[PDB]
Amino acid sequence: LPDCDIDKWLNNFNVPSPLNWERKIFSNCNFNLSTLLRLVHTDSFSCNNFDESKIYGSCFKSIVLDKFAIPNSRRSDLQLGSSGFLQSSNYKIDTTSSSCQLYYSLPAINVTINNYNPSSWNRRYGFNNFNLSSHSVVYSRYCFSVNNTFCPCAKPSFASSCKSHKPPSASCPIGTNYRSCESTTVLDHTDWCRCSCLPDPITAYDPRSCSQKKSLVGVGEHCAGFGVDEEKCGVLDGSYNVSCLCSTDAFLGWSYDTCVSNNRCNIFSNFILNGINSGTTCSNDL
């Protein structure tokens, strides 16, 4: 009986990036597809594992809507089955379900992009916000996951004993292990310290020592977090009087690009069709 109002949700001027893509479940309502594509500035609307003509005058259990702004240089990544950065590290399109992809746009003058890091462990150790220009759209290139016991700082007691290659140090939160380091000797040089995730988790010579583990996003998931250069978490000769905190530029593997072309911000949207010919999410097109 109530209206789905999908167009109003797709036309909200607070548009997220692919990193923090938003989802709205539409169920138990009535929608007009033909007016939907009219009310939004539709560029393209195709369907996969489903033929579009069978949406008109049909009922579904629910219609799941994912949306995010499109970085202009990364539009090709949204092709189904692409190995690009967007689907590897931000939003993986479900290619098995009955879906439909919708490309549209909003007037750039009124759009405010919301770049937000969804990683809980990125925010725990220093990441606040992206201070980027307006209409810049963040996308991650690589994601890294960690256990709950993670901390990127070396122990202050270990660092103090380093004669060479001393790592930055600080105190880690309670319940988290310190950065795995090791005092080593080579030739006559003693107390040559060696820590993990070097040079950085992206190009780590030995990824098995780095607690930060590469992870591709799956369907319905968000980015696990940016890899952090652990040589930039904590300060040199940092004591237990200093909380473990990484600088802003220690977070790696992410870029950005505007969504504005022809004075309009381009937006992507993924439709999920659940239970065809079953449910109370009906179409009024007939």
Q: Which of 109, 120, 163, 280 binds ligand NAG (CB under 6 A)?
A: 109
DSSP letter, residue 211: S
User: Of 110, 131, 262, 263, which lies in the binding site for ligand NAG, with binding defined by CB under 6 A?
Assistant: 110
Q: Which is nearer to other proteins, 70 or 143 (CB)?
A: 143
Q: Is 277 in the site for other proteins (CB under 8 A)?
A: no
Binding of ligand NAG by 213 (CB under 6 A): yes
Please say whether the beta carbons of 126 and 111 come within 8 A: no
- 2 binds other proteins per the rule CB under 8 A: no
* Residue 207 or 279 having the CB closest to ligand NAG: 207
Contact between 273 and 54 under an 8 Å Cβ cutoff? The reply is no
Q: Does residue 147 interact with ligand NAG by CB under 6 A?
A: yes
Is 149 near ligand NAG (CB under 6 A)? yes
Q: What is the DSSP string of 259-276?
A: -EETTEEEEEEEEEEEST
| 14-40: burial string, b at 16+ Cβ within 10 Å, e else | ebbbbbbbbeeebeebebbbeebeeeb
Q: Using CB under 8 A, which of the segments 79-87, 123-131, 229-237, 260-268 binds other proteins?
A: 79-87
Least distance to ligand NAG, CB of residue 284, Å = 26
110 binds, among ligand NAG, other proteins, none (CB under 5 to 8 A by kind): ligand NAG
* Distance from C-alpha of 244 to C-alpha of 155, rounded to nearest angstrom: 10
Burial of 276 (0-12, 13-18, 19+ CB in 10 A): middle
Identify which of residues 109 and 236 has a Cβ nearer to ligand NAG in the complex: 109
Other C-beta atoms within 10 Å of 125: how many?
Answer: 27
207 binds, among other proteins, ligand NAG, none (CB under 5 to 8 A by kind): other proteins
Query: Is the CA virtual torsion 143, 144, 147, 148 positive or negative?
Result: negative
Residues that bind ligand NAG (CB under 6 A): 109-110, 147, 149, 213
